[PDB]
Design an enzyme around this catalytic site. Structure first.
Site, PDB file in Angstrom:
ATOM      1  N   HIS A 113       0.494  -0.693  -0.035  1.00 27.81           N
ATOM      2  CA  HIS A 113       0.255  -0.197   0.424  1.00 27.81           C
ATOM      3  C   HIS A 113       0.577   1.386   0.120  1.00 27.81           C
ATOM      4  O   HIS A 113       0.244   1.990  -0.593  1.00 27.81           O
ATOM      5  CB  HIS A 113      -1.209   0.105   1.053  1.00 27.81           C
TER       6      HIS A 113
ATOM      7  N   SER B 244       5.087   7.602   2.277  1.00 25.63           N
ATOM      8  CA  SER B 244       3.821   8.540   2.818  1.00 25.63           C
ATOM      9  C   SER B 244       3.052   8.313   3.271  1.00 25.63           C
ATOM     10  O   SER B 244       1.865   8.876   3.714  1.00 25.63           O
ATOM     11  CB  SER B 244       3.437   8.900   1.068  1.00 25.63           C
TER      12      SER B 244
ATOM     13  N   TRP C 274       3.531 -12.905  -8.849  1.00 28.31           N
ATOM     14  CA  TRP C 274       4.125 -13.843  -7.800  1.00 28.31           C
ATOM     15  C   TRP C 274       4.054 -12.881  -6.787  1.00 28.31           C
ATOM     16  O   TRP C 274       4.044 -13.457  -5.457  1.00 28.31           O
ATOM     17  CB  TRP C 274       4.917 -13.889  -8.930  1.00 28.31           C
TER      18      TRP C 274
ATOM     19  N   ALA D 295      -8.088 -11.246   6.446  1.00 25.25           N
ATOM     20  CA  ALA D 295      -8.933 -10.403   5.989  1.00 25.25           C
ATOM     21  C   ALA D 295      -9.150  -9.221   7.533  1.00 25.25           C
ATOM     22  O   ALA D 295     -10.086 -10.478   8.307  1.00 25.25           O
ATOM     23  CB  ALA D 295      -9.690 -10.252   4.784  1.00 25.25           C
ATOM     24  N   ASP D 296      -9.890  -8.639   7.581  1.00 20.54           N
ATOM     25  CA  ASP D 296      -9.999  -7.893   8.537  1.00 20.54           C
ATOM     26  C   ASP D 296     -11.548  -7.041   8.250  1.00 20.54           C
ATOM     27  O   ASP D 296     -12.286  -6.999   9.333  1.00 20.54           O
ATOM     28  CB  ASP D 296      -9.375  -6.682   9.247  1.00 20.54           C
TER      29      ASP D 296
ATOM     30  N   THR E  24      -2.670 -21.814   5.929  1.00 23.62           N
ATOM     31  CA  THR E  24      -1.386 -22.160   6.427  1.00 23.62           C
ATOM     32  C   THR E  24      -0.800 -20.343   7.160  1.00 23.62           C
ATOM     33  O   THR E  24       0.379 -20.247   6.050  1.00 23.62           O
ATOM     34  CB  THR E  24      -0.235 -23.070   6.511  1.00 23.62           C
TER      35      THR E  24
HETATM   36  C1  HEM Z   1      -2.831  -7.537  -7.208  1.00 25.75           C
HETATM   37  C2  HEM Z   1      -3.887  -6.865  -6.682  1.00 25.75           C
HETATM   38  C3  HEM Z   1      -4.231  -7.077  -4.445  1.00 25.75           C
HETATM   39  C4  HEM Z   1      -5.375  -7.101  -4.109  1.00 25.75           C
HETATM   40  C5  HEM Z   1      -6.641  -6.658  -5.226  1.00 25.75           C
HETATM   41  C6  HEM Z   1      -5.785  -7.550  -3.054  1.00 25.75           C
HETATM   42  C7  HEM Z   1      -6.455  -7.196  -1.622  1.00 25.75           C
HETATM   43  C8  HEM Z   1      -6.450  -8.251  -0.017  1.00 25.75           C
HETATM   44  C9  HEM Z   1      -7.478  -7.476   0.673  1.00 25.75           C
HETATM   45  C10 HEM Z   1      -8.808  -7.210   0.395  1.00 25.75           C
HETATM   46  C11 HEM Z   1      -7.134  -7.970   1.551  1.00 25.75           C
HETATM   47  C12 HEM Z   1      -7.522  -8.154   2.976  1.00 25.75           C
HETATM   48  C13 HEM Z   1      -7.358  -6.063   3.659  1.00 25.75           C
HETATM   49  C14 HEM Z   1      -8.194  -6.776   4.657  1.00 25.75           C
HETATM   50  O1  HEM Z   1      -9.972  -7.162   4.874  1.00 25.75           O
HETATM   51  O2  HEM Z   1      -8.282  -6.662   6.151  1.00 25.75           O
HETATM   52  C15 HEM Z   1      -5.324  -8.192   1.815  1.00 25.75           C
HETATM   53  C16 HEM Z   1      -4.195  -8.332   2.604  1.00 25.75           C
HETATM   54  C17 HEM Z   1      -2.661  -8.632   2.757  1.00 25.75           C
HETATM   55  N1  HEM Z   1      -2.507  -8.134   1.319  1.00 25.75           N
HETATM   56 FE1  HEM Z   1      -3.451  -8.322  -0.886  1.00 25.75          FE
HETATM   57  N2  HEM Z   1      -3.974  -7.569  -2.479  1.00 25.75           N
HETATM   58  C18 HEM Z   1      -3.160  -7.757  -3.260  1.00 25.75           C
HETATM   59  C19 HEM Z   1      -2.213  -7.623  -3.731  1.00 25.75           C
HETATM   60  C20 HEM Z   1      -1.248  -7.648  -3.157  1.00 25.75           C
HETATM   61  C21 HEM Z   1       0.444  -7.291  -2.663  1.00 25.75           C
HETATM   62  C22 HEM Z   1       1.198  -7.020  -3.799  1.00 25.75           C
HETATM   63  C23 HEM Z   1       1.049  -7.731  -1.702  1.00 25.75           C
HETATM   64  C24 HEM Z   1       2.464  -7.792  -1.129  1.00 25.75           C
HETATM   65  C25 HEM Z   1       3.023  -7.304  -0.879  1.00 25.75           C
HETATM   66  C26 HEM Z   1      -0.523  -7.864  -0.611  1.00 25.75           C
HETATM   67  C27 HEM Z   1      -0.011  -8.264   0.923  1.00 25.75           C
HETATM   68  C28 HEM Z   1      -1.227  -9.161   1.625  1.00 25.75           C
HETATM   69  C29 HEM Z   1      -1.191  -9.149   2.854  1.00 25.75           C
HETATM   70  C30 HEM Z   1       0.101  -9.514   3.732  1.00 25.75           C
HETATM   71  C31 HEM Z   1      -2.406  -8.948   3.469  1.00 25.75           C
HETATM   72  C32 HEM Z   1      -2.724  -9.179   4.510  1.00 25.75           C
HETATM   73  C33 HEM Z   1      -3.230  -7.834   6.103  1.00 25.75           C
HETATM   74  C34 HEM Z   1      -3.834  -8.736   6.593  1.00 25.75           C
HETATM   75  O3  HEM Z   1      -3.994 -10.134   7.733  1.00 25.75           O
HETATM   76  O4  HEM Z   1      -4.285  -7.867   7.901  1.00 25.75           O
HETATM   77  N3  HEM Z   1      -1.370  -7.438  -1.706  1.00 25.75           N
HETATM   78  N4  HEM Z   1      -4.999  -8.433   0.234  1.00 25.75           N
HETATM   79 CA   LIG Z   2       0.613 -20.123   3.840  1.00 20.31          CA
HETATM   80 CA   LIG Z   3       3.935   5.851  -1.238  1.00 26.11          CA
HETATM   81 FE   LIG Z   4      -7.124  -5.258  11.316  1.00 21.97          FE
HETATM   82 ZN   LIG Z   5      -4.082  -6.305  13.718  1.00 30.69          ZN
END
Ligand code: HEM
Ligand SMILES: [Ca+2]
Ligand SMILES: [Ca+2]
Ligand SMILES: [Fe+3]
Ligand SMILES: [Zn+2]
Ligand SMILES: [Fe+3]
Ligand SMILES: [Fe+3]
Ligand SMILES: [Fe+3]
Ligand SMILES: [Fe+3]
Ligand SMILES: [Zn+2]
Ligand SMILES: [Zn+2]
Ligand SMILES: [Zn+2]
Ligand SMILES: [Zn+2]
Length: 319
Positions: free
Chosen positions: A47, A64, A164, A174-175, A189
């Site tokens: 983000h 930022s 990738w 997701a929260d 996992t």
């Molecule tokens: C390509 C499109 C992507 C979409 C649409 C997407 C969407 C989302 C959404 C909706 C969540 C859950 C947020 C919540 O409700 O708490 C999430 C979590 C997460 N995203 Fe993705 N994501 C994308 C790409 C990425 C990428 C490129 C990364 C690389 C760092 C990433 C890393 C994560 C991680 C680690 C979480 C877990 C956060 C947690 O456990 O609270 N995402 N993402």
């Molecule tokens: Ca896993």
């Molecule tokens: Ca930035």
């Molecule tokens: Fe949270």
């Molecule tokens: Zn938290």
């Protein structure tokens, strides 16, 4: 170089990171675990970094999202981000590195705690951010494949690179997608950096783990798991499905491609040649625990095969 406490690193400038490492491992990551704060910090790397568009502006991996938190954390796609921003901000204030550096450093340290994980290359020296990201630069789970790929492409990523990078969803929950079931993971996992995400998103959906009408949510195959509509589509769309399946039971590929593509993402808006390589400060990750499998009671017929060229591989199920 040898730092004051006896730890070594190739470039002496990197010595400043060792006290930061120790602080975050204990006080952000709960004693070097691959848990909530690792997941949140990894989401924060994206983000922060993806706020980068030649056309639209934003400085990429610049801190930022912390420096201009008042603006950025109110963007709809940044729902729930405020929590990790608020947790990280005092570490940034205490230590003497930029917010952009800190975000990428914390993400790399955190991933290294996860069995099966990697050391994402880490470079030191980003200057402070000078502009907020524009809104509407972070992909959302209700967005089409075409939209997601165009946005990621605008930032510099090919469709295979998007796949990738989504190995991140192997250590993720997701929260806000369904706030009735906060903390529900995307794979079985969430503490292990493995191919389970790529397997389990390919299964036929069965149920909603919480409520049934959330924007950006698809049916999950498992009560303990949530599925994003974006991941549903990326696993199945002709542009991405073959790459998605190629990750399954391919731990070396997941490792290599995630580290390289995360380094690229960590450097959006930056110039590596003006930074110092501090990659060797990141801890050695543990080896993978477990191996690729279908969930207990499932079989190959439950897989929605989407790669015309190559059949889905023959996995065994949990007993
Ligand atoms: C390509 C499109 C992507 C979409 C649409 C997407 C969407 C989302 C959404 C909706 C969540 C859950 C947020 C919540 O409700 O708490 C999430 C979590 C997460 N995203 Fe993705 N994501 C994308 C790409 C990425 C990428 C490129 C990364 C690389 C760092 C990433 C890393 C994560 C991680 C680690 C979480 C877990 C956060 C947690 O456990 O609270 N995402 N993402
Ligand atoms: Ca896993
Ligand atoms: Ca930035
Ligand atoms: Fe949270
Ligand atoms: Zn938290
Ligand atoms: Fe602020
Ligand atoms: Fe500063
Ligand atoms: Fe400053
Ligand atoms: Fe299992
Ligand atoms: Zn904790
Ligand atoms: Zn948190
Ligand atoms: Zn310090
Ligand atoms: Zn398509």
């Amino acid at each position: 170089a040898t730092c004051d406490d006896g730890r070594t690193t190739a470039n002496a400038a990197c010595c400043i990171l060792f006290p930061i490492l120790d602080d975050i491992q204990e006080n952000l990551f709960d004693g070097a675990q691959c848990g909530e704060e690792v997941h949140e910090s990894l989401r924060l790397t994206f983000h922060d970094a993806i706020g980068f568009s030649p056309t639209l502006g934003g400085g990429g991996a610049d801190g930022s999202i912390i420096a201009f938190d008042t603006i950025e954390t109110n963007f709809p796609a940044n729902a729930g981000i405020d929590e990790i921003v608020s947790a990280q901000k005092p570490f940034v204030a205490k230590h003497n590195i930029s917010a952009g550096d800190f975000i990428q450093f914390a993400g790399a340290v955190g991933v290294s705690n996860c069995p099966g994980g990697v050391r994402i290359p880490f470079f030191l020296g980003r200057p402070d951010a000078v502009a907020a990201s524009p809104d509407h630069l972070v992909p959302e789970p209700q967005d089409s494949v075409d939209s997601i790929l165009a946005r990621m492409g605008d930032a510099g990523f090919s469709p295979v690179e998007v796949v990738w990078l989504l190995a991140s969803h192997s250590i993720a929950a997701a929260d806000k997608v369904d706030p009735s079931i906060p903390g529900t993971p995307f794979d079985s996992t969430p503490g292990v950096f493995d191919s389970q995400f790529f397997i389990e998103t390919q299964l036929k959906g069965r149920l909603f783990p919480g409520t049934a009408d959330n924007k950006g949510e698809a049916q999950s195959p498992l009560q303990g798991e949530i599925r994003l509509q974006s991941d549903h589509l990326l696993a199945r769309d002709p542009q991405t499905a073959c790459e998605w399946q190629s990750m399954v039971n391919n731990q070396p590929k997941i490792q290599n491609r995630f580290a390289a593509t995360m380094s690229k993402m960590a450097l959006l808006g930056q110039d590596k040649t003006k930074l110092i390589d501090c990659s060797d400060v990141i801890p050695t990750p543990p080896a993978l625990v477990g191996a690729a499998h279908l969930p207990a009671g499932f079989s190959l017929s439950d897989v929605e095969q989407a790669c015309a060229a190559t059949p889905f591989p023959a996995l065994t199920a949990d007993p």
